[PDB]
């Protein structure tokens, strides 16, 4: 799979490289000209993928000229990966941010937009501004989208060829677009391509995080009095006592009905209770926001392990991109000791032995106390070193700078991801950055000195990483080890574990674990077994896998809400996009008036079988339509069920035409549209609140036994279909009963 | 006087520099032997300050490429006294400190430079080692985990460097030693404390404990650790707020050191608004005007959420800026580097103390930093273009600081503020408050506070009422002083235990320092026998009141001393009380003489010492536990119009007095009951 894709891509790389001379000979204007020229071709029905070699060749040359930098072949590969529904895994230091100029350019050609998704505003802003002169060189515009930005500025940012901004704010824009009353209010365009800069946090860790817009844009207060008023007779089964009372729920209904849920919430708040609240107007999770893009792609580092998750949550394939130089870091067999003490003793040994050959070491621990421990023992053994202490960030940046210096030893606690590159030999710019007026032959010096240090650290084996314990998450171990062997540099790594260590628990048999014990790891000595390393890694994988199972069940609950939100927003946007909702109105009125009479007159039925005590009233009650109708048919005996069905619809229409000559065609059309949006909104927010309740009234509504979800999907899909019909009927009522000072 | 008098000295040192420039390095190394010899012959240390400091300045010029500035000589002088030097950020505290360290190393008693953490202790011992080696002095470094022989060595160096924690710990472990040769520290001579706010104030009352199996075996607070030194001094920022505290906790004076260049930062009057919304609009508008003229702005807020709000509103206003987000370290350092760049706008949440310098115009050093292969005139173009930006930000007013809210502690406000106007640069600051602000609540009255709403403030009609700046500053001053009034009560209690530990460690040390404890043993044997006997034979009473049965058993049970006292008495109608007490002593001794003929004398001497120490350490451990219990019962034991304390002091005193008698007892019961096989 990865092997043959990569082969096929290496072939296209060789095409691109051969085009380099053509792009070189080209003037700056001629280069800017390729864009319109690709677009002309696309307009004539070219396939965008056929453009990859020339477009990449064009972007590569532009970047030589604007940035002074020329995409490496691995970067060309990474770019082609990101044209597909894929994650490019590119090792820290491989140049993700330059890589990303390639797919961003290519996927801008069709004029549909590109969303570059950064983790924070600083990078959005930084990247937009760094790339603006590149992409302007190429006749594209760039937009920057930020929180607080006004809507007209936002509209421009989204109308640029390429956009930068954080995941959050993309989401938030989406929601507010789905709260618009006119389509000119939208800031976004159709969601074309999302290129996510760091997928681990953005797509995975934060997959289920809801984006919520709330607004004290509540409404009602009556209920909390009504429902309170019942409570000063509640005196320490208990469903029935509650049920049978008032002018809400009269008709022998059920309160524990997933339907009366807001009510039940009212009573159970009123009982718990012994200015306006701001409800959710709109929600989406990130995972479901990303799933809306026609095309999705992104980048992460080589630390992987979550390929199975990207695939199942997002259908993102993943391509492991080679590094530009050979990755020669030596990841040695995990070692396993009886006790911590024995473990540390052999850790200190390793460090002793290495720092004496001039090799620098970075010790990653799982806690401060674990740090202080390995530290103090290093001091006991006479080994100089420094701890990165999270309280002294300044000291930490200075430590980190000399951390590749010969025989340097640095201890870090639960170390993060990416982090500052550690330069072997020490950093030599960090050194002239300290020189308040330098020279050519001071510089010469610093650098000569440094090459000698650097070549000696490489020759001593590069940065050695020591993991004093492993994490449950291998991704994290992998990020630790990944700080060594960057850009082809020698380095190595080794993890230590002991039988005393926390992680021993991940095997889930305590005695099955205590069998390595029976290889009693003798004091002086040591062996290495390749199967242990794979056991451990396998176990880390199984914990990850079971965690993701747990999470798949959560995402299934989520798919219920996604499916309902997609459908309803789809309906809302059909309406929004139409200036004239009138024929939709005509059809719903018919739907509503057929069903409404059906529930009183049975189709193709006998006058013997028709009723008014509730009908007659229902029509006056919900429609301000008063047809004292009994007599129509005892005074005009012949017409018939179908010529009358017709006739009531006709009336209703006549009262409506009447109100409209009074108000204005347009004014009316626009009101109806407004009513249909406002009512869909109301219902939907009601619906969301009710689902949230069920969903929590269902971590425990009942039983280890039967199926909680399932029943929940059914209840919830069911209320969504009820809401769909209640929307038709509530819109028609409104239009029927609307007051206007007449003739 | 002290400043104007110190300036005279500085004039002397300045006038000696031609002299010193004429000296070779070896001549300069030589002055240290010369100073010491003068000292041997009776010279007062303070008489050397001119020569010593001028030598240290020349040594620094040659070794560091740095010449101490005049204000730095002043600081170093201050630090020779029992005194806190206040020096503003950027003034070169670290170089300044080399002066008194040098001076106070000269008598050969040692110097402890106290650092907040192990990185700085090593960093500065190594940075300074060649300066001090240039001058014939050695440097020691003390770390946690360091073997005793290496610590012993660090403490034998002329000047030592380490954290407060490790210094204090060493002291307690030294006071758990069973031979004096085990001690790591020398007499506590001079402590130079680097960040006295954290080290001496915030942490004054924090106990350093050693436990074992779990229970406290040794304890001392930081205050009382530093109070052991003969000379104490320290450094902090002029961000003041705690001088009265230093005097009370430590008997340190404080001296504000003048900046090398004049301070010209314009700290404008504080501004009050009705609402948070009105506050932001005034902030936005300040930024707007200031950035349109090229001036950079740093904005400090009191939460993430308030940073956001101020951020979104700037954006809403079309003002580009960057938030410092604690989640993104690398971004933050990148942002900081250029936060002095024209019209830059930067927002920081609960800005934390000193922080990184903001170079006006931008940092150009982080420009050369960014190069792959920087080349001389790649630089000059960088430095020259920078000089233009720097001077344009200076002309524009330097860095403007905006507080969007004040913290209840003014030290925090002052640290935000102090980020501007460093080393003579132009700068300004403004703090914003609203009636909706949490701080309004420090006034402790709704209505008093709420009166100021009557100013009716009104947008683009803000006035400026100076009285309000000072009313605020006084409020923050009252809160501190309140909190310290309480703390002073808590230290009145700490002092009880302090004195008790002084007393008991003194004693213990006296024992430790000697190899023969015989005078004391013989002498406490008498005490113990008297008291034990007194319990059964009330002095000067008739025979009828004596419990000779009770005394017989007691001697057997606690002294393995089995005497037929009833037979003596009965057989010598002769023998009376005094004479009887003497027999009992004599016997105990003869029994002891005999074990000593077996065991050997020097073995016995050392047995007796070890027993005294160990018995002391057990009773003390017990005593600390019970002093703890007694103190936390402090509420309802002392009740209605006595002082609790007075009472606590009384109970404490009694309990300590009883322990010393009870120490005597157990030592002699042990020495009495020790089994030895008679051959
Ligand atoms: N083709 C290239 N030629 C020259 N310099 C490059 C090239 N590609 C990248 N660089 C430089 O290499 C560095 C590597 O890191 P970069 O900011 O791209 O992130 P990375 O480590 O791959 O991942 P991330 O960017 O997400 O932190 C950058 O300094 C970049 O300017
Ligand atoms: N006399 C001098 N000549 C040249 N440079 C000096 C001189 N004195 C101090 N410096 C430099 O001034 C800078 C600020 O000093 P230092 O690190 O002592 O900062 P500080 O804020 O005063 O001390 P601290 O960080 O301990 O609070 C340092 O980079 C230091 O080397």
Angle, helix B243-250 to helix B466-512, in steps of 10 degrees: 20
User: Does the CB of B382 have a partner CB in chain A at under 8 Å?
Assistant: no
Q: How long a stretch of residues is chain A?
A: 743
For ligand 1, the distance from its centroid to the CA atom of residue B372, given in whole angstroms, is 13
Look at the block and give the residue holding tokens 């090229």.
B294
**Coil, strand, or helix at residue B582?**
helix
**Residue B89 Cβ contacting ligand 2 at under 6 Å:** yes
Helices (H), B546-600: 548-559, 565-571, 577-599
Per the structure block, which two tokens stand in for B435? Answer: 């009636």
Closest C-alpha to A331, from A506, A93, A94, A490: A490
- Taking an 8 Å cut-off on Cβ atoms, the answer to whether A147 and B312 are in contact is yes
> Given ligand 1 and candidates A95, A117, A423, which is best to mutate, with the most ligand atoms within 8 Å of its CB?
A95
CA distances from A107 to A55, A271, A310, A635 (A): 10, 57, 22, 72
- The CA distance from B368 to B383, in Å, is 10
- The CA distance from B347 to A467, in Å, is 37
User: Does the CB of B366 have a partner CB in chain A at under 8 Å?
Assistant: yes
> Given ligand 1 and candidates A59, A79, A91, A98, which is best to mutate, with the most ligand atoms within 8 Å of its CB?
A98
Look at the block and give the residue holding tokens 């309406």.
A575
Min distance B516 CA to chain A CA atoms (Å): 34
User: Does the CB of A379 have a partner CB in chain B at under 8 Å?
Assistant: yes
Closest C-alpha to A386, from A369, A363, A366, A356: A363
**Residue B69 Cβ contacting ligand 2 at under 6 Å:** yes
- Residue whose CA is at the smallest distance from ligand 2 atom 12: B92
Which residues of chain A make contact with B371, given a CB cutoff of 8 A? 429
Closest C-alpha to B162, from B119, B133, B198, B209: B119
CA distances from A315 to A1, A167, A704, A740, B528 (A): 16, 19, 33, 54, 88
For ligand 1, the distance from its centroid to the CA atom of residue B13, given in whole angstroms, is 54
User: Does the CB of B13 have a partner CB in chain A at under 8 Å?
Assistant: no
Are residues A104 and A78 in contact, defined by beta-carbon separation less than 8 angstroms?
no
Are residues A167 and A206 in contact, defined by beta-carbon separation less than 8 angstroms?
yes
- The CA distance from A624 to A621, in Å, is 6
Angle, helix B49-63 to helix B70-78, in steps of 10 degrees: 130
Ligand 1 atom with minimal separation from the A197 CA? 26
- Taking an 8 Å cut-off on Cβ atoms, the answer to whether B119 and A397 are in contact is no
Which of A164, A427, A429 should one mutate to test binding to chain B, selecting the residue with the greatest count of B CBs within 10 A?
Answer: A429
User: Does the CB of A383 have a partner CB in chain B at under 8 Å?
Assistant: no
DSSP structure class, residue B132: H
CA distances from B47 to A438, B52, B77, B102 (A): 41, 9, 12, 14
Are residues B92 and B60 in contact, defined by beta-carbon separation less than 8 angstroms?
no
- Residue whose CA is at the smallest distance from ligand 1 atom 17: A97
**Residue A98 Cβ contacting ligand 1 at under 6 Å:** yes
- The CA distance from A116 to A195, in Å, is 5
B354, closest residue in chain A (CA to CA): A394
- The CA distance from A290 to A298, in Å, is 11
Q: How long a stretch of residues is chain B?
A: 679
Are residues B189 and B111 in contact, defined by beta-carbon separation less than 8 angstroms?
yes
Ligand 2 atom with minimal separation from the B237 CA? 27
Are residues A317 and A298 in contact, defined by beta-carbon separation less than 8 angstroms?
no
Mode of pairing for the β-strands spanning B297-301 and B345-349:
parallel
Are residues A87 and A199 in contact, defined by beta-carbon separation less than 8 angstroms?
yes
Are residues A226 and A246 in contact, defined by beta-carbon separation less than 8 angstroms?
yes
**Residue B92 Cβ contacting ligand 2 at under 6 Å:** yes
Which of A123, A125, A148 should one mutate to test binding to chain B, selecting the residue with the greatest count of B CBs within 10 A?
Answer: A148
Give backbone dihedrals phi and psi of A406, rounded to 5 degrees, phi first: -45, 130
- Taking an 8 Å cut-off on Cβ atoms, the answer to whether A121 and B330 are in contact is no
Q: Is A425 annotated as a binding residue?
A: no
Dihedral angle, C-alpha A571, A575, A577, A579, nearest 10 °: 170
- The CA distance from B252 to B245, in Å, is 9
Min distance B539 CA to chain A CA atoms (Å): 59
Instruction: Please give the full DSSP string across B324-364, using - where no structure is assigned.
Output: --TT-HHHHHHHHHTTTSTT-EEEEES--TT-----TT--S
User: Does the CB of A147 have a partner CB in chain B at under 8 Å?
Assistant: yes
Handedness of CA B460, B463, B464, B467 (dihedral sign): negative
CA distances from A729 to A431, A622, A732 (A): 75, 9, 5
- The CA distance from A392 to A398, in Å, is 10
A395, closest residue in chain B (CA to CA): B119
Identify the bridge partners of residue A410 per DSSP, sorted by sequence position. Answer: A362, A386
- Residue whose CA is at the smallest distance from ligand 1 atom 10: A95
Ligand 1 atom with minimal separation from the A70 CA? 1
Chain centroid offset of residue A58 CA: 32
What is the number of alpha carbons within 13 Å of residue A351 lying toward its C-beta? 30
Instruction: Please give the full DSSP string across A230-263, using - where no structure is assigned.
Output: TGGG----HHHHHHS-SSSSTTT--SSSTTSHHH
**Coil, strand, or helix at residue A384?**
coil
Mode of pairing for the β-strands spanning A162-166 and A115-118:
parallel
**Residue A89 Cβ contacting ligand 1 at under 6 Å:** no
Look at the block and give the residue holding tokens 């003596």.
B568
User: Does the CB of B143 have a partner CB in chain A at under 8 Å?
Assistant: yes
Are residues A354 and A361 in contact, defined by beta-carbon separation less than 8 angstroms?
yes
- The CA distance from B509 to A184, in Å, is 87
Q: Is A734 annotated as a binding residue?
A: no
- The CA distance from B99 to B113, in Å, is 12
CA distances from B20 to A396, B26, B66, B72 (A): 39, 12, 15, 18
For ligand 2, the distance from its centroid to the CA atom of residue B92, given in whole angstroms, is 3
**Residue B91 Cβ contacting ligand 2 at under 6 Å:** yes
Are residues B340 and B426 in contact, defined by beta-carbon separation less than 8 angstroms?
no
**Residue B430 Cβ contacting ligand 2 at under 6 Å:** no
Per the structure block, which two tokens stand in for A302? Answer: 């080589």
Identify the bridge partners of residue B215 per DSSP, sorted by sequence position. Answer: B212
- The CA distance from A364 to A479, in Å, is 10
A69, closest residue in chain B (CA to CA): B372
Give backbone dihedrals phi and psi of B389, rounded to 5 degrees, phi first: -80, -45
Strands annotated E in B387-484: 399-403, 427-434
Residue B617 burial (10 A CB sphere; 0-12, 13-18, 19+):
middle
Domains recognised in chain B with CATH numbers: 1-261 (3.40.50.300), 262-679 (no CATH)
- The CA distance from B569 to B515, in Å, is 41
Closest C-alpha to B106, from B75, B132, B67, B126: B132
Chain centroid offset of residue B376 CA: 46
From the list B117, B143, B146, which residue is nearest A392 (CB)? B117
Are residues B303 and B405 in contact, defined by beta-carbon separation less than 8 angstroms?
no
For ligand 1, the distance from its centroid to the CA atom of residue A97, given in whole angstroms, is 6
From the list A120, A375, A437, which residue is nearest B325 (CB)? A120
Look at the block and give the residue holding tokens 């069911």.
A718
Are residues A410 and B178 in contact, defined by beta-carbon separation less than 8 angstroms?
no
Which of A374, A379, A385 should one mutate to test binding to chain B, selecting the residue with the greatest count of B CBs within 10 A?
Answer: A379
């Amino acid at each position: 799979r990865n092997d043959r894709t990569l082969r096929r891509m290496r072939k296209v790389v060789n095409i691109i490289n051969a085009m380099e001379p053509e792009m070189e000979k080209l003037s700056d204007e001629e280069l800017k000209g390729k864009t319109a020229e690709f677009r002309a071709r696309l307009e004539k029905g070219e396939v965008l993928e056929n453009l990859i070699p020339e477009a990449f060749a064009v972007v590569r040359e532009a970047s030589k000229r604007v940035f002074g930098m020329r995409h490496f072949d691995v970067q060309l590969l990474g770019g082609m990966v990101l044209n597909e529904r894929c994650i490019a895994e590119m090792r820290t230091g491989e140049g993700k941010t330059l890589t990303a100029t390639l797919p961003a350019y290519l996927n801008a050609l069709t004029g549909k937009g590109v969303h570059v998704v950064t983790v924070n505003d600083y990078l959005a802003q930084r990247d937009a501004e760094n790339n603006r002169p590149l992409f302007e060189f190429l006749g594209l515009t760039v937009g920057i989208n930020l929180p607080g930005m006004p809507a007209p500025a936002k509209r421009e940012a989204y109308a640029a060829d390429i956009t930068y901004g954080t995941n959050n704010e993309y989401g938030f824009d989406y929601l507010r677009d789905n709260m618009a009353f006119s389509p000119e209010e939208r800031v976004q365009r159709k969601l074309h391509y999302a290129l996510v800069d760091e997928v681990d946090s953005i797509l995975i860790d934060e997959a289920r995080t809801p984006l919520i817009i709330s607004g004290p844009a509540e409404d009602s207060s009556e209920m909390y009095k009504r429902v309170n008023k019942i409570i000063p007779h509640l005196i320490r089964v208990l469903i029935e006592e509650l049920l049978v009372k008032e002018g809400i729920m009269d008709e022998g209904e059920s309160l524990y009905s997933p339907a009366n849920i807001m009510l039940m919430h009212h009573v159970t708040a009123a009982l718990r209770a012994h200015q306006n609240e701001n409800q959710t107007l709109a929600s989406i999770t990130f995972q479901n926001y990303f799933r809306l893009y026609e095309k999705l792609a992104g980048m992460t580092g080589t630390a992987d392990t979550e390929a199975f998750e990207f695939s199942s949550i997002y259908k993102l394939d993943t391509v492991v991109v080679p590094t530009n130089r050979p990755m020669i870091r030596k990841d040695l067999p995990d070692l396993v000791y009886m006790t911590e003490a024995e473990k540390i003793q052999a850790i200190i040994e390793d460090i002793k032995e290495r720092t004496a050959k001039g090799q620098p070491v970075l010790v990653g621990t799982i806690s401060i106390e674990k740090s202080e421990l390995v530290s103090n023992e290093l001091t006991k053994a006479g080994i100089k070193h420094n701890v990165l202490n999270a309280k002294f960030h300044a000291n930490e940046a200075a430590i980190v700078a000399q951390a590749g210096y010969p025989a340097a030893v640095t201890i870090a606690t639960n170390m993060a991801g990416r982090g500052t590159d550690i330069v072997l030999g020490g950093s030599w710019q960090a050194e002239v950055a300290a020189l308040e007026n330098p020279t050519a032959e001071q510089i010469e010096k610093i650098k000569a000195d440094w090459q000698v240090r650097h070549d000696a650290v490489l020759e001593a084996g590069g940065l050695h990483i020591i993991g004093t314990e492993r994490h449950e998450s291998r991704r994290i171990d992998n990020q630790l080890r990944g700080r060594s062997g960057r850009q082809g540099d020698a380095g190595s790594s080794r993890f230590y574990l002991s039988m005393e260590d926390a992680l021993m628990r991940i095997f889930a048999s305590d005695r099955v674990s205590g069998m390595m014990r029976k290889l009693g790891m003798k004091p002086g000595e040591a062996i290495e077994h390749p199967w242990v390393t794979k056991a451990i890694a396998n176990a880390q994988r199984k914990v990850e896998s079971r965690n993701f199972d747990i999470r798949k069940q959560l995402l299934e609950y989520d798919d219920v809400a996604n499916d309902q939100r997609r459908a309803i927003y789809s309906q809302r946007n059909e309406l929004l996009d139409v200036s004239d909702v009138s024929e939709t109105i005509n059809s719903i009125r018919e739907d509503v008036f057929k069903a409404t009479i059906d529930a009183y007159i049975p189709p193709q039925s006998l006058e013997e079988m028709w009723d008014i005590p509730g009908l007659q009233e229902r029509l006056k009650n919900d429609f301000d339509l008063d047809l004292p109708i009994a007599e129509w048919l005892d005074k005009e005996p012949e017409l018939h069920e179908e010529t009358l069905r017709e006739r009531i619809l006709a009336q209703s229409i006549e009262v409506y035409q009447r109100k409209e000559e009074v108000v204005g065609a347009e004014m009316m059309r626009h009101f109806e549209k407004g009513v249909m949006l406002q009512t869909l909104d109301s219902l939907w927010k009601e619906h969301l609140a009710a689902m949230d309740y069920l969903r929590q009234g269902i971590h425990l509504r009942g039983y280890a036994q039967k199926d909680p979800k399932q029943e929940y999907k059914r209840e919830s899909f069911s209320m969504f279909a009820a809401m769909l019909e209640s929307l038709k009927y509530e819109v028609i009522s409104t239009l029927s009963k609307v007051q206007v000072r007449m003739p």
